[PDB]
Amino acid sequence: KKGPFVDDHLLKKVDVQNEKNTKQVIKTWSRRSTIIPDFIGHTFAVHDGRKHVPVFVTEAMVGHKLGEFAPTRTFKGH
Amino acid sequence: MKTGIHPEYVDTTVQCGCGHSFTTRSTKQSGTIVVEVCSQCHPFYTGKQKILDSGGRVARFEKRYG
Amino acid sequence: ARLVGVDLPRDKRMEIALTYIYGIGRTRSNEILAATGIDKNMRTKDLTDDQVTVLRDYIEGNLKVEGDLRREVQADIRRKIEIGCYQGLRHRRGLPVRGQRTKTNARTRKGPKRTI
Amino acid sequence: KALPRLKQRYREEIREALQQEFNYANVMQIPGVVKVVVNMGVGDAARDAKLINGAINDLALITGQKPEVRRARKSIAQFKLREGMPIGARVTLRGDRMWEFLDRLISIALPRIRDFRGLSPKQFDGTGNYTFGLNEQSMFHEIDVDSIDRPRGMDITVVTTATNDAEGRALLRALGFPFKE
RNA sequence: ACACAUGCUACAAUGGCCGGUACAAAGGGCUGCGAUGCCGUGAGGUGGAGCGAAUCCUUUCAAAGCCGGUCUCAGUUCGGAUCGGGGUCUGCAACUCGACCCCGUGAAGUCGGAGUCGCUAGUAAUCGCAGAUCAGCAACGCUGCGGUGAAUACGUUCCCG
């Protein structure tokens, strides 16, 4: 419950993105954190290994780690 | 009103826990109602509490407090 | 007796009679009955309406119950099923959410059995 | 008691304020409750013979009237019906029975239902009548809570002389009946 | 969407829950085991006594046991799956995928069809304990240690080798 993670590469990139007020689709490797509410509004191209899925970040995303707004497995059954 | 088929219909005295007392006609044989509810509706308060219930970004900033 | 909204039985002790509400289990009964002052060994036939008053005001004041808990949760489950989480996907498809075994067991989420 | 309590306050206060709100310009033009009818459920007809006497008894001692047993207009086949089976009784209230039923339920029945947030303002017909649903029962302290095995629900209708619908909202708002925007 | 297989927890009173109390064996420990004390409800936090250990630590070690109170046969003070909120610790990192604790939630399940398995005395049955692997753990596993401790075997006709 102490210092949470932060994704320092994504942290450096995110700050640059919001200082310039520029919004850009991001091809992001990171499945591990949506750390601050500074990430709100930025589109994240989440990488499940194989392709990048665009994810809009809103106010409810805070507290859910970044990777599984995009799922890694596919199942139908028939 | 027909005579014998209707149930007996008596005055009553309704009392709540705060003592706010009500006098009515009623069907109770006891002649009284010892109730726990008075004209103190909690919807006004319950609704406010429910409205107050949402909002979690603040809670997160709570855990993290800087 | 009558309370916050749960009809109490005929003959139960108080630390079990409080448990039949959605927000109260055994430990909350052991802490509520310690804070208010009602004996836990009291039956429901022997319960006082003033004890219903003090107990009722305590456990609607400092704790949440039936409507708060339920349309209360059920706002949090639909919260994570609206935003598109993976646990949202598990609640969508009717699968176990904690990432546990799905190959053989987890029959309590799939439910009754159809066999192909 | 010359006037029932709800009527004690209705005969002066709600009428004077409702004239304040609406300038009918004619006395007498000025809505009031006509009847309070209490339809009764069941639908267990054909399936179970005994219960309807459970409902006759149920309507009675919630209010002190012998509910008149109302039966089927026609035998419609899917939901087992038969022409002449009893399907729920109703009781029509007017006068001292109407007002003493109303004040009592108002200061007794409405608060008790668990998680009772309010009642919808929308539930009017075209002409000022309000109907709402009591799903279970045992909102009333008239019914002893161990006498009562299965929950029998009911509709309660207030029928007014309201030529509009906000007429009836205004009456039933000033009259002590709950609502929730 | 499934089907099999080995296990564990159960379906309650020879039981559950609260209080008091008695008895083990073996093991493990260096960037390890970590005490009294203090902060927590509790995982644990702060701290480092003391030990390369018949010495210190794992508390003087247990749990089932015994004494007492309560529960009165009920889908329950049985049962804990599931789900929500709130945490702690390990790790660069607990989303997909960790364990543990707190509050709530409280499902199936009323001894289980055909069939089938283990066991001949400290055995079966039941009760905890330690270890290896290991930062953490999917350990209910595996390997061991001890506690309490039965019934039955007339006998080779029948099944199996």
Helix axes B43-53, C66-82, angle to 10 degrees: 30
The CATH-assigned architecture of domain C72-116 is Irregular (4.10)
| Residue bearing tokens 């904690």 | C98
Domain at A1-78, CATH homologous superfamily: Ribosomal protein S19/S15 (3.30.860.10)
Experimental method: cryo-EM
3-class secondary structure, D17: helix
Q: Report the candidate in D38, D18, D30 with the shortest Cα–Cα distance to residue D175.
A: D18
Our answer on whether D and B touch (3+ beta-carbon pairs < 8 Å) is: yes
β-strand partners of D133? D155
Chain A interface includes C89 (CB < 8 A) = yes
Q: Tell me which residues from 46 to 105 on chain C have a beta carbon below 7 angstroms from nucleic acid strand E.
A: 69, 73, 76-77, 80, 86-87, 93-100, 103-104
State which nucleotides on strand E lie below 7 Å from a protein beta carbon.
1-5, 70-72, 76-77, 81-89, 92-98, 102-107
Q: Tell me which residues from 1 to 30 on chain C have a beta carbon below 7 angstroms from nucleic acid strand E.
A: 11-13, 15-16, 19-29
Chain D interface includes C5 (CB < 8 A) = yes
Helix axes C66-82, C86-93, angle to 10 degrees: 110
Chain A interface includes C85 (CB < 8 A) = yes
The structural domains of chain C, with segments of one domain joined by +, span 1-71, 72-116
Q: Which amino acid is at A6?
A: V
Contact D165, D128 (CB under 8 A): yes
Our answer on whether C and D touch (3+ beta-carbon pairs < 8 Å) is: yes
Q: Which amino acid is at A7?
A: D
d(CA B42, CA B48): 10
Residue C57 belongs to what H/E stretch? helix C49-61
The CATH-assigned architecture of domain C1-71 is Orthogonal Bundle (1.10)
D152 CA – E17 C1', rounded, Å: 38
DSSP for chain B, please give it: --SSSSPP-EEEEEE-TT--EEEEEES-SSSEEE-S--S--SHHHHHHHHHHH---HHHHHHHH--
Cα separations (Å) of D172 from D31, D33, D167?
Answer: 10, 9, 9
Resolution reached, in Å?
3.4
The structural domains of chain A, with segments of one domain joined by +, span 1-78
Any idea what DSSP says for residue A59? G
